[PDB]
Structure to design on (758 residues):
């Protein structure tokens, strides 16, 4: 029932009725699971191998044959891999070399299937992150898209580093603002690269404060992770003194979630981190800063709209 | 002075007092022009002492006059207010209309729907409040027009802010409730509400589901049973309560649902019991599918340490006792405590389950090397497991098997050793009045 309906269309699909015949293999293949890895050893490998040979990456056109690209990523997803992935590791790295969506699905698939096997996997992404980071000067030359979003989750999964440390604090001193989605994605990028604190020069103060003051208030899934990351970086017990000695705490205004959504759900999170920040040093606070700190703390004791857990703290 | 010194705060009793002076001024006869300016700095400014001061008075303000309340209170042509002033006005306006009748309101709505006028000044939650106000005037009391003015946030590329985006869908489901059978928006709202459901959308979808819940399943005449894919999208690529609260109130998808629900469940631990309620309601409303379902669930509860409610469902409802309960072979102390508190649970609830008489050899194999050492340093299970033992066995080699296991336990008495040995003999005597008298002399000593 599912043996003669797929083998007789190898050269037809590879070298273009075909589209409707291919679109029916969406939820009808999982039922026909009679072969348990015994027949599909080398039967499926050449299938997607020839599929990726076609399907050009011409982004300037208005999707001439991108329906086939959507179809091939839909059928590749339903293959669990346990053995013989050395050809796969030699095949999946050719899609991020050059409507950037095919690489997102592939990088997700390899992220989930990596656990059962073990490989060193050091072949390409040793200086690739460097090229991505040095493409930022080209970004500001063009504008003032989906290529610099996920270099880190692979690294985070791989780390279950000196060359990586230098690449971390380089983009934190440039990309200064002199939008719709560019600025939202731009801030989203520095949020990921500053989230890594698993490795452990006071060159990160200016970069982190600029994004906090220019944080887009229209988004709701951006300030939550940013404040959570800010909570993590103050719990190192060693680097909690470098940051509260240069800015002189000029962020005592409504810039930590101003708007409507950010002051309702994660409202206690901003004050809890601020309370933790003061509790860290408690040694280099002058009289003027202490007078301002108690003035801000005297207003949270009266806010009877939120549960009194913060007032006890 | 109230207009002028507003920037002084951002000499301490002035905000307490000047508002209190205007408090009594409007309490004399009515509020016509002074009512709209006494809120100029009341709810805004982040004051240390201006909360729960005017709040009680609005609920007491309502107790012929509220019929025409909108025209002489709401607009008034201020030319000085902004978004914050409009919000403060609608906080006190909602209770006035919520507690409460002429036919002259029709012209009011025509004037009301002419607010934007090609200019979108709003950049805050004022849109949500108007939609909530629009729902209040419709549910508690031109239909084509109000559909057209709620258009721009019913898209997928615009209306970035989730609060105003979900409110547009919220009002769409509230309007179409009785007989508005369409071809596009009748199902567009159904498969767009549970898209990218964040943690702050629960308070929005809670009232956005019950309006059309008893209607969509009754109006599936033009449907194609395309609800399995919509459920699959949120159960594979992505809460889970949105898929079961409809079932809580009240065949072709059970095969996929069971596989999906048993895969997603593996700090999200308070969902397995809720799924048991959904399953037990399916059986009550109605076992080729409950066999492996209950086996996996008993594994899930065994992985927890909801204990009382899951036991209640078990008593009001082969491979289970072969692969998981063989933990005492190696066991460390905390695991025995968890095991001891767990063996007391299910062994007490299987006294009225026809399963021991049908298959008990696998049960003995699992507890083969578990009962020999399951009598020391345990106070909870050991002290009470005897009561369940007298109601199991009452055939030859198996009988001698635990008899050999039994005799190697209480024949080395020579005080937990005395506590365990004495308790077992009481169980042995309670098993049957017959007892040999070839070992009494040891007991006398």
């Amino acid at each position: 029932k599912k043996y003669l309906q797929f083998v007789a269309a190898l050269t037809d699909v590879n070298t273009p009725k075909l589209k409707m015949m291919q679109e029916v293999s969406e939820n009808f293949e999982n039922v026909t699971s009679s072969p348990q890895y015994s027949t599909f050893l080398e039967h499926i490998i050449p299938r997607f191998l020839t599929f990726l040979q076609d399907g050009e990456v011409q982004f300037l056109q208005e999707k001439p044959a991108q329906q086939l690209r959507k179809l091939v990523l839909e059928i590749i997803h339903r293959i669990p891999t346990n053995e013989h992935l050395r050809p796969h590791t030699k095949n999946v790295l050719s899609v991020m070399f050059r409507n950037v969506l095919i690489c997102l699905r592939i990088i997700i698939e390899l992220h989930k299937q990596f656990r059962p096997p073990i490989t060193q996997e050091i072949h390409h992404f040793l200086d690739f992150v460097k090229q991505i980071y040095k493409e930022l000067p080209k970004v500001v030359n063009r504008y003032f898209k989906v290529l610099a979003e996920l270099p880190i989750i692979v690294v985070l999964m791989y780390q279950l580093n000196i060359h990586n440390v230098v690449a971390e604090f380089v983009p934190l001193i440039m990309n200064t603002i002199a939008y719709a989605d560019f600025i939202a994605a731009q801030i989203k990028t520095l949020s990921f690269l500053a989230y890594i604190i698993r490795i452990y020069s006071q060159q990160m103060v200016k970069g982190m404060l600029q994004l906090l003051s220019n944080c887009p208030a229209e988004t709701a899934h951006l300030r939550k992770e940013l404040l959570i990351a800010a909570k993590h970086i103050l719990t190192t017990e060693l680097r909690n003194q470098f940051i509260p000695c240069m800015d002189k705490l000029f962020d005592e205004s409504i810039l930590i979630g101003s708007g409507y959504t950010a002051r309702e759900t994660l409202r206690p999170l901003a004050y809890s981190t601020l309370a933790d920040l003061v509790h860290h040093v408690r040694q280099h606070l002058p009289l003027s800063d202490l007078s301002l700190a108690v003035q801000l703390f005297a207003k949270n004791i009266d806010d009877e709209s939120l549960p009194s857990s913060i007032q006890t703290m | 002075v109230w207009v002028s010194e507003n920037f002084q705060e951002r000499n301490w009793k002035e905000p307490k007092l000047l508002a209190y002076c205007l408090l009594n001024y409007c309490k004399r006869n009515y509020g016509d022009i002074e009512l709209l300016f006494q809120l100029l700095r009341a709810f805004t400014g982040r004051f240390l002492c201006n909360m729960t001061f005017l709040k009680e008075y609005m609920e007491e303000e309502i107790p012929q006059k509220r019929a025409l309340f909108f025209r002489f209170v709401d607009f008034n042509d201020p030319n000085f207010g902004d978004e914050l002033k409009a919000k403060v006005l609608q906080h006190i306006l909602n209770p006035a209309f919520l507690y409460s009748n002429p036919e002259s309101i029709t012209s009011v709505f025509i004037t009301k729907v002419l607010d934007p006028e090609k200019q979108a000044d709003m950049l805050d939650s004022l849109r949500i409040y108007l939609l909530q106000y629009a729902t209040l005037l419709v549910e508690h009391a031109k239909l084509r027009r109000l559909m057209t003015f709620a258009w721009p946030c019913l898209l997928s590329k615009a209306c970035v802010d989730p609060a105003c985006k979900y409110s547009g869908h919220l009002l769409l489901a509230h309007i179409i409730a009785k007989f508005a059978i369409h071809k596009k928006i009748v199902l567009q709202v159904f498969h767009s509400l549970l898209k990218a459901h964040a943690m702050e959308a629960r308070a929005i979808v809670r009232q956005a589901m019950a309006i059309l819940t008893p209607a969509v399943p009754a109006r599936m005449e033009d449907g194609h049973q395309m609800l399995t894919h919509w459920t699959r999208k949120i159960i594979v690529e992505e809460l889970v309560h949105i898929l079961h609260l409809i079932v809580q109130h009240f065949h072709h998808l059970v095969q996929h649902m069971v596989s999906a629900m048993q895969r997603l469940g593996f700090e999200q631990r308070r969902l397995a019991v809720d799924l048991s309620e959904v399953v037990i309601k399916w059986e009550l409303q109605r076992d080729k599918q409950h066999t492996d379902t209950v086996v996996n669930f008993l594994i899930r509860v065994a992985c927890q340490v909801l204990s009382r409610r899951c036991v209640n469902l078990l008593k009001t409802a082969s491979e289970l006792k072969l692969q998981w309960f063989d933990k005492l072979l190696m066991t460390v102390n905390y695991g025995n405590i968890c095991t001891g508190l767990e063996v007391l649970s299910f062994l007490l609830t299987v006294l009225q389950s026809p399963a021991i008489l049908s298959s008990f050899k696998p049960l003995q194999r699992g507890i083969a090397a578990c009962m020999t050492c399951g009598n020391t340093k345990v106070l909870r299970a050991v002290h009470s497991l005897l009561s369940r033992l007298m109601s199991i066995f009452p055939y030859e080699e198996l009988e001698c098997l635990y008899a050999a296991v039994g005799k190697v336990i209480y024949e080395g008495l020579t005080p937990s050793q005395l506590f365990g040995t004495l308790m077992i003999l009481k169980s042995a005597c309670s098993n049957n009045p017959s007892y040999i008298d070839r070992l009494i002399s040891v007991f006398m000593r």
